[PDB]
Amino acid sequence: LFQAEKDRRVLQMLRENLEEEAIIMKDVPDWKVGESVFHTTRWVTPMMGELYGLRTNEEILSATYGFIWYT
Amino acid sequence: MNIMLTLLTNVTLASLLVLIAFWLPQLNAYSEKTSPYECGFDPMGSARLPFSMKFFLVAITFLLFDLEIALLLPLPWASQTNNLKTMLTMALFLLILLAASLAYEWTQKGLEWAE
Amino acid sequence: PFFDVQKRLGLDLDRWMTIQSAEQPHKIPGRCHAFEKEWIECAHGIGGIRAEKECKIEFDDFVECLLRQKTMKRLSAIKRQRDKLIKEGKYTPPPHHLGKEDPRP
Amino acid sequence: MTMYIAFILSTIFVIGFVGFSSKPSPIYGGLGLIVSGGVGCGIVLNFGGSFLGLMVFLIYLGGMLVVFGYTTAMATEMYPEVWVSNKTVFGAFVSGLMMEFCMVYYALKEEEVEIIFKFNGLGDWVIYDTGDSGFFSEEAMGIAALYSYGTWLVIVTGWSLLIGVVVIMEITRGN
Amino acid sequence: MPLVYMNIIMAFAIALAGLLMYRSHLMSSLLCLEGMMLSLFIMSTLIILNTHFTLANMMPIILLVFAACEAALGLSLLVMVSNTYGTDYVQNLNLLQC
Amino acid sequence: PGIVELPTLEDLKVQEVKVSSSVLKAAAHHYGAQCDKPNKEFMLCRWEEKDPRRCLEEGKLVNQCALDFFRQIKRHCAEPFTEYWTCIDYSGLQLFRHCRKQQAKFDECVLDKLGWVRPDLGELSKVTKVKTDRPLPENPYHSRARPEPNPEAEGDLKPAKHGSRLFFWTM
Amino acid sequence: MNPIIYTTLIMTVMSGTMLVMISSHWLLIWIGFEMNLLAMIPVLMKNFNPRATEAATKYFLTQATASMMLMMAIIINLLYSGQWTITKMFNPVAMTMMTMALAMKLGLSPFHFWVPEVTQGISLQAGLLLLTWQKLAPLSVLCQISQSINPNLMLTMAMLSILIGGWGGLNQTQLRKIMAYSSIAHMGWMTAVLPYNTTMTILNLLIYITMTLAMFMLLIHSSATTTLSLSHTWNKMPVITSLMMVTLLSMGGLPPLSGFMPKWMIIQEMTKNESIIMPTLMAMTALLNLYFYMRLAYSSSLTMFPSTNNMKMKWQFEHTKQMKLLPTMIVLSTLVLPMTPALSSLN
Amino acid sequence: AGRIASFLKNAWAKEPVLVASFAIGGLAIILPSLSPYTNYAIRINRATPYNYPVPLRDDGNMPDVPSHPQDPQGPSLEWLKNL
Amino acid sequence: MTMMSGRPGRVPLQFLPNEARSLPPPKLTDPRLVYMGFLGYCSGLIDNAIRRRPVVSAGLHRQLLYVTSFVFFGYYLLKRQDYMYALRDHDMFAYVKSHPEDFPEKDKKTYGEILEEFHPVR
Numbered sequence A: 001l002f003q004a005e006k007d008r009r010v011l012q013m014l015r016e017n018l019e020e021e022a023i024i025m026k027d028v029p030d031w032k033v034g035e036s037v038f039h040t041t042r043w044v045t046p047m048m049g050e051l052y053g054l055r056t057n058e059e060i061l062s063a064t065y066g067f068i069w070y071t
Numbered sequence B: 001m002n003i004m005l006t007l008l009t010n011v012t013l014a015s016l017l018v019l020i021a022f023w024l025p026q027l028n029a030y031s032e033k034t035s036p037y038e039c040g041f042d043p044m045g046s047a048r049l050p051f052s053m054k055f056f057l058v059a060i061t062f063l064l065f066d067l068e069i070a071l072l073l074p075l076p077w078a079s080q081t082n083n084l085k086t087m088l089t090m091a092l093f094l095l096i097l098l099a100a101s102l103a104y105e106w107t108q109k110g111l112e113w114a115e
Numbered sequence C: 001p002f003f004d005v006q007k008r009l010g011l012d013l014d015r016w017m018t019i020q021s022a023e024q025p026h027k028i029p030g031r032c033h034a035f036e037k038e039w040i041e042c043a044h045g046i047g048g049i050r051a052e053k054e055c056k057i058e059f060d061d062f063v064e065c066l067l068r069q070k071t072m073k074r075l076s077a078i079k080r081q082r083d084k085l086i087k088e089g090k091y092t093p094p095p096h097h098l099g100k101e102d103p104r105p
Numbered sequence D: 001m002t003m004y005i006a007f008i009l010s011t012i013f014v015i016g017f018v019g020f021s022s023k024p025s026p027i028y029g030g031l032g033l034i035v036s037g038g039v040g041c042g043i044v045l046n047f048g049g050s051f052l053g054l055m056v057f058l059i060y061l062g063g064m065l066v067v068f069g070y071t072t073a074m075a076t077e078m079y080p081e082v083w084v085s086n087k088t089v090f091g092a093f094v095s096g097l098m099m100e101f102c103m104v105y106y107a108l109k110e111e112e113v114e115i116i117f118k119f120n121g122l123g124d125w126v127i128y129d130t131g132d133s134g135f136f137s138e139e140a141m142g143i144a145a146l147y148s149y150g151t152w153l154v155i156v157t158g159w160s161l162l163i164g165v166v167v168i169m170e171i172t173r174g175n
Numbered sequence E: 001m002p003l004v005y006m007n008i009i010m011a012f013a014i015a016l017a018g019l020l021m022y023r024s025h026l027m028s029s030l031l032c033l034e035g036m037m038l039s040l041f042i043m044s045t046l047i048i049l050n051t052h053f054t055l056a057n058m059m060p061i062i063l064l065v066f067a068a069c070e071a072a073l074g075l076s077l078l079v080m081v082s083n084t085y086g087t088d089y090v091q092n093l094n095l096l097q098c
Numbered sequence F: 001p002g003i004v005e006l007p008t009l010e011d012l013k014v015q016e017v018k019v020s021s022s023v024l025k026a027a028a029h030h031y032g033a034q035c036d037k038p039n040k041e042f043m044l045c046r047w048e049e050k051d052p053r054r055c056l057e058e059g060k061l062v063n064q065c066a067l068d069f070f071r072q073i074k075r076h077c078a079e080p081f082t083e084y085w086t087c088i089d090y091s092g093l094q095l096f097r098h099c100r101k102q103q104a105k106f107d108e109c110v111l112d113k114l115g116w117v118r119p120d121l122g123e124l125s126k127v128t129k130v131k132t133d134r135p136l137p138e139n140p141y142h143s144r145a146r147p148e149p150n151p152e153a154e155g156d157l158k159p160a161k162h163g164s165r166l167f168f169w170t171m
Numbered sequence G: 001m002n003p004i005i006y007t008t009l010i011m012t013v014m015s016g017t018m019l020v021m022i023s024s025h026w027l028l029i030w031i032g033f034e035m036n037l038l039a040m041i042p043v044l045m046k047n048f049n050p051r052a053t054e055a056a057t058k059y060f061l062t063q064a065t066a067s068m069m070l071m072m073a074i075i076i077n078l079l080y081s082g083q084w085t086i087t088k089m090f091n092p093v094a095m096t097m098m099t100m101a102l103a104m105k106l107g108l109s110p111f112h113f114w115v116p117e118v119t120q121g122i123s124l125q126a127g128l129l130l131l132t133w134q135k136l137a138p139l140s141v142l143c144q145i146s147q148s149i150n151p152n153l154m155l156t157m158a159m160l161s162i163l164i165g166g167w168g169g170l171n172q173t174q175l176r177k178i179m180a181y182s183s184i185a186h187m188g189w190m191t192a193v194l195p196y197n198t199t200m201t202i203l204n205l206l207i208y209i210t211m212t213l214a215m216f217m218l219l220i221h222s223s224a225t226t227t228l229s230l231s232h233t234w235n236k237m238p239v240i241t242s243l244m245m246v247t248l249l250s251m252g253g254l255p256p257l258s259g260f261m262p263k264w265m266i267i268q269e270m271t272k273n274e275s276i277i278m279p280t281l282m283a284m285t286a287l288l289n290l291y292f293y294m295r296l297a298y299s300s301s302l303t304m305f306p307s308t309n310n311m312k313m314k315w316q317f318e319h320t321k322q323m324k325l326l327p328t329m330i331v332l333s334t335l336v337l338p339m340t341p342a343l344s345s346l347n
Numbered sequence H: 001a002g003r004i005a006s007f008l009k010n011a012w013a014k015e016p017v018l019v020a021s022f023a024i025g026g027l028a029i030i031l032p033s034l035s036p037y038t039n040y041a042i043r044i045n046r047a048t049p050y051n052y053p054v055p056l057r058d059d060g061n062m063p064d065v066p067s068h069p070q071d072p073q074g075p076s077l078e079w080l081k082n083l
Numbered sequence I: 001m002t003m004m005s006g007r008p009g010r011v012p013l014q015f016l017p018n019e020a021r022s023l024p025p026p027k028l029t030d031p032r033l034v035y036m037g038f039l040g041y042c043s044g045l046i047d048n049a050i051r052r053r054p055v056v057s058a059g060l061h062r063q064l065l066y067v068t069s070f071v072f073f074g075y076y077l078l079k080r081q082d083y084m085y086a087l088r089d090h091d092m093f094a095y096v097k098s099h100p101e102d103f104p105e106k107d108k109k110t111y112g113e114i115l116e117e118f119h120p121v122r
């Protein structure tokens, strides 16, 4: 159940980032929305910055240092 | 985050105590009061002169024996491996070599202080 | 120079530690396990000279996984454009990107 | 961007390295190395290396106690030097400080390749992994694997330690 | 690369420069050697932690072990040097020329 | 280098399970006993596809089975279960061994009202088999074609022509 | 030093070198280097005196700096590719660091300064070990990573080594410093051909080791460390001086002696790669090594220097300890040119 | 027989700490090879499920793989409960 | 820089692969073997000379052992060297065969139709 929820949450975050990027970067002439940086077409586990790039600093802090700093 | 706050609080309290101790009382500092103490008299030499170490060899050996601690600390986690025989053999071998080092220095008069 | 005693005797003195995609304890995977696996299987048995050229795509993907330079560049470009559009007031971030989102498990 | 705690810690690390590399009296060099060891422990703790950081701090504390004793024995002078008691020491300290300042400025203000490569900074938090599983710590498991995977490493390390004891005894014999 | 990597590499460069430029005391150069080892430990630990290379987690500890040996070695030599000269100044080690 | 395809937000909607970790831990043994088939199908899809986008329907089935299980528990006896999970929830480590009377009551209730038997120690950690109609992925790694190897070494070994041929040496 | 302790130390040095040779992991190669240095420091200090202590200290400082640079190169290579295997470095900066570290370990110019001092400060046995066995591990590592060598830096260091070896040897009267400068020049010759053919490097190393062993054993047998002390050998053991003169001629690369075989081979190999100017300069420079070898031969065996009266007493005593491998080493140092094609067995 | 007896008596009279240390170390070296519970310790270590057991894709030719945890097939920790 | 050490199917530390048995062994009267024995004899004579013994006649068993050891090692050295040269020729011929486009056969003209420049000596 945790696995299914994690997949849904990650995919939702990535889709939200995709839509925001599509809205934001409409003016740049040679930019493809959602273009990958890998030649391979297989699934790549998202990096922290990709998931939390366009969010608040508090969410980023909780995502990065939340577990380590919890005591 | 909590540990940083605790460390800051402790250091701040100690520094504030030092500040109180140095700024609250009345100070009368003159050259005789602040002179070095040698129980009645002026020291003959400097306290910055070399001070011989008679246990220098044991001090060096402490450096090598301090890393056996690093090697032996992950033993509680190593005890959870499936191949317990190999892990036990390696741990016993490491401790045996440490004991052999201690015995070698002991029998070569390496634990006796210099005269 | 390199007397391969390990290969002659079949000992594995240090080959268990050479690569990231090789039998970690508890099956814990490396961050770039798939990319390294792809590159190693591409380059196996053809020699270094041929592997440098014919397996350059796999190695580039592996290095991108390792250091994430291109991803950081893309994220920086997106954020720079977002800041430029926000300073002139043409763009507004959505509520879920401002801390007022509806969380899900 | 997030509070740049790791950047501040690494800057203090570099400052301590400048402090003991300008070479004042070995008392203050040992103090600077102790500070650098503690701060590097903090960095590794922030990246998730609790055991490794704590162990490096402990090891360097013991080594620096031995170094302090040896400095009082055979590395003293009438007026031990501090970072401001010498033109050479102060010059080296200042040069290191401004060199770190220049490197940092050329790093976070623009993308330039100093020696090896270039980058933008952006704080460490970006390049994490968001791995979500486990009832253990991967660092502890990898370190504990030394007794099951690293038999060869244990053998060579123990041999080198015993040989080092024999070697120091041979060297300090004199005659 | 993060700015932390650059800071650690700069720390190693500073320690190497401090070792290569000698003042009188040999103990200071030994401390520079120890600082170089510490920076190497930090750099390797950060790389191995970031890449989640599990079996490499034992690599830094091994480094420390041999660091100790080197440290001990240096201190041993220092003792003998002092015993000959009453001082650890490197300018007394000039009996041999090129 | 191509466009990453992602499911729409409508595709990712599902009836979520909004019970806390203590409730889940209290129910976990019977939950793994009863809802094994969808969970195992989802996990097999997950470990064979190596792509979260290819196992969304299995995840939705997992959610549906969990909701049905909890609905049955709520329908038959929620008070023994509430006592059990409250006792579990007090502990800071959520230890099972501090709540054995409440666990006994909940186990008795489920056994008499539904015929649910708690799995014995060692059972839920077995490796099991899953019957599925999902075809086995042929290239889950999206691997490129492997470069051809160097041809081979073949033939019968003959002595070197005119020896070593190193300067004046005739052998 | 106890004989058992000395045997253990020599075995530890050799096992560290072999660990470097047989390892596939960079960490194990570094461990082998560390073990070799740790066990090798006491051997330099077996006979205790201030000069030996100074030589040991200088050697330790140089090798520790080299080891730290070595580890930094390894760590950078790991950073830019998650690899520990010693195949070929993936970063040019790491390659430069590794090349400089191995050059400092080998004593190539401009890292040559410690070699004459350390050789002069230790005994002839320690000098033999230092100038023969200590070259194997860095050369093996360099051979394994040869395809990643930047040819410009390696060739610059090799040419500098040849030139500086000749010029420094031109000025020496102590035999240990002469041997050290010969070692520097020969190491430059070894590393000049490394980016082209590692078999030539192995062959040069083998020939140089044989001739160095013969030279040092002849110097131990006639217990001389200066030119004027060696000028007395003819009045006690003329055969030793004659064999030494022939060995010195071989070390100068004169045909048809063995020492001509490596340079010759190296030269021809370089001409296969359209390298003409550099081999010519290297040979014309090795003329200097030949010159000071001929000076030593003039003082030692071709003319008769005045002797002392007490030498008569030495006429009444033989050598109680004999070196079993000296005749074979001399023969290999001189008469192996006709067996040149056997180098194909080395590849 | 008697020489070792006299040596042990002298050691016990002069260095009881060393005698106890050597005895404890020797027992620690020897005893594990003679114990029947070392195998039990290994089996207990193997029986701890740190990671998820990934199910196998059924192909109709595995009589010894369960289709459900409560099925009789597979390993059993019945021995562990009584241990 | 390392031509033959990475050859496929190479056992690490053999010194004599099995395929080397397909080659003719060197004759025991090989001139190279005779030179190896001569080297052993010279080593024996130098051994006599250094120890201050009658050079030509002191230890006959020692000279015999010197010569025998040198010949024994030289036989296997010659076998390995011959095998390595045979391997080089085999690989070269195979590579030439497998790449006809890099080693083309071009028709050769006779000297009656090739115009060569004449340089008078005067």
Ligand SMILES: CCCCCCCCCCCCCCCCCC(=O)OC[C@H](COP(=O)([O-])OCC(O)COP(=O)([O-])OC[C@@H](COC(=O)CCCCCCCCCCCCCCCCC)OC(=O)CCCCCCCCCCCCCCCCC)OC(=O)CCCCCCCCCCCCCCCCC
Pocket: G238, G239, G242, G243, G246, G256, G301, G302, G334, G335, I042, I045, I046, I049, I053, I054, I055, I056
């Ligand atoms: C290329 C083609 C092939 C060529 C072959 C290669 C060259 C020749 C072979 C080289 C190696 C062999 C001999 C070397 C060891 C000898 C040791 C020695 O000292 O000799 C003394 C020894 C006489 O001493 P003794 O009998 O005990 O009583 C007199 C006292 O000892 C009183 O004696 P002492 O010690 O008191 O006298 C003091 C003397 C002691 O000083 C010496 O004796 C000099 C020894 C130098 C050792 C040679 C270096 C090692 C080999 C390298 C050769 C390089 C060749 C390349 C070209 C460069 C030439 C330098 O010191 C001096 O006078 C200072 C002189 C300094 C001037 C500079 C020249 C010195 C170096 C010249 C070396 C020339 C090459 C070797 C020629 C043969 C020399 C015996 O000479 C001999 O009797 C051995 C000669 C050979 C006889 C065996 C022949 C076999 C029997 C016939 C059977 C027929 C065979 C075929 C069968 C056919 C069927 C019928």
Ligand SMILES: CCCCCCCCCCCCCCCCC[C@@H](O)O[C@H](CO[C@H](O)CCCCCCCCCCCCCCC)COP(=O)(O)OCC[N+](C)(C)C
Pocket: B016, B017, B019, B020, B023, B024, B025, B026, B027
């Ligand atoms: C237990 C942990 C909690 C503790 C919490 C309190 C922490 C206290 C920290 C230390 C304070 C204790 C010291 C006792 C009173 C402080 C007196 C001293 O610090 O200041 C004096 C102030 O002197 C200053 O030099 C002159 C005052 C002018 C400078 C003040 C700057 C701003 C004032 C401008 C006026 C307008 C008001 C602006 C503020 C609103 C200097 O006196 P001095 O003789 O040397 O030292 C001996 C003091 N004796 C006599 C008590 C023994």
Ligand SMILES: CCCCCCCCCCCCCCCCC[C@@H](O)O[C@H](CO[C@H](O)CCCCCCCCCCCCCCC)COP(=O)(O)OCC[N+](C)(C)C
Pocket: B083, B086, B089, B093, C013, C023, D148, D149, D151, D152, D155, D159
């Ligand atoms: C050729 C001459 C032989 C004698 C001289 C050799 C000189 C070198 C010293 C010893 C050689 C090292 C060989 C041992 C390599 C270790 C690896 C191998 O032995 O397997 C180990 C087998 O364990 C053995 O018990 C090794 C221990 C034996 C060594 C201990 C004492 C010997 C040391 C002697 C020399 C050291 C210095 C001097 C000490 C006095 C562990 O394998 P295992 O655990 O199944 O599975 C691991 C894989 N997993 C993780 C996936 C499960």
Ligand SMILES: CCCCCCCCCCCCCCCCC[C@@H](O)O[C@H](CO[C@H](O)CCCCCCCCCCCCCCC)COP(=O)(O)OCC[N+](C)(C)C
Pocket: C001, C002, C003, C004, G203, G206, G207, G210, G332, G333, G336, G339, G340, G341, G342, G343, G345, G346, G347, I005, I011, I012, I013, I014, I015, I077
């Ligand atoms: C002064 C002249 C040189 C003398 C050299 C010393 C002679 C005595 C040495 C004792 C003989 C035993 C040596 C080896 C025998 C068995 C070991 C064998 O298994 O090793 C093989 C190797 O065989 C040996 O290397 C051959 C040694 C033969 C050396 C003699 C050639 C000298 C050149 C011509 C001078 C004439 C010499 C005359 C002799 C008296 C394995 O090959 P490999 O592991 O894959 O290669 C490793 C290096 N690579 C990968 C980088 C290529």
Ligand SMILES: CCCCCCCC/C=C\CCCCCCCC(=O)O[C@H](COC(=O)CCCCCCC/C=C/CCCCCCCC)COP(=O)(O)OCCN
Pocket: B096, B099, B102, B103, B106, B107, H008, H011, H014, H015, H018, H019, H020, H021, H022, H023, H024, H025, H026, H029
């Ligand atoms: C097989 C076990 C191996 C592993 C277990 C060991 C673990 C650690 C124990 C070893 C640590 C190092 C021991 C070092 C030994 C040094 C001996 C020595 O030289 O000390 C002597 C003292 O000891 C001696 O006399 C020499 C050895 C005496 C015997 C010691 C024990 C030997 C073995 C006996 C135990 C056998 C096993 C127990 C069997 C039980 C009986 C049935 C000198 O003492 P000083 O302090 O210098 O004197 C100053 C004041 N006068």
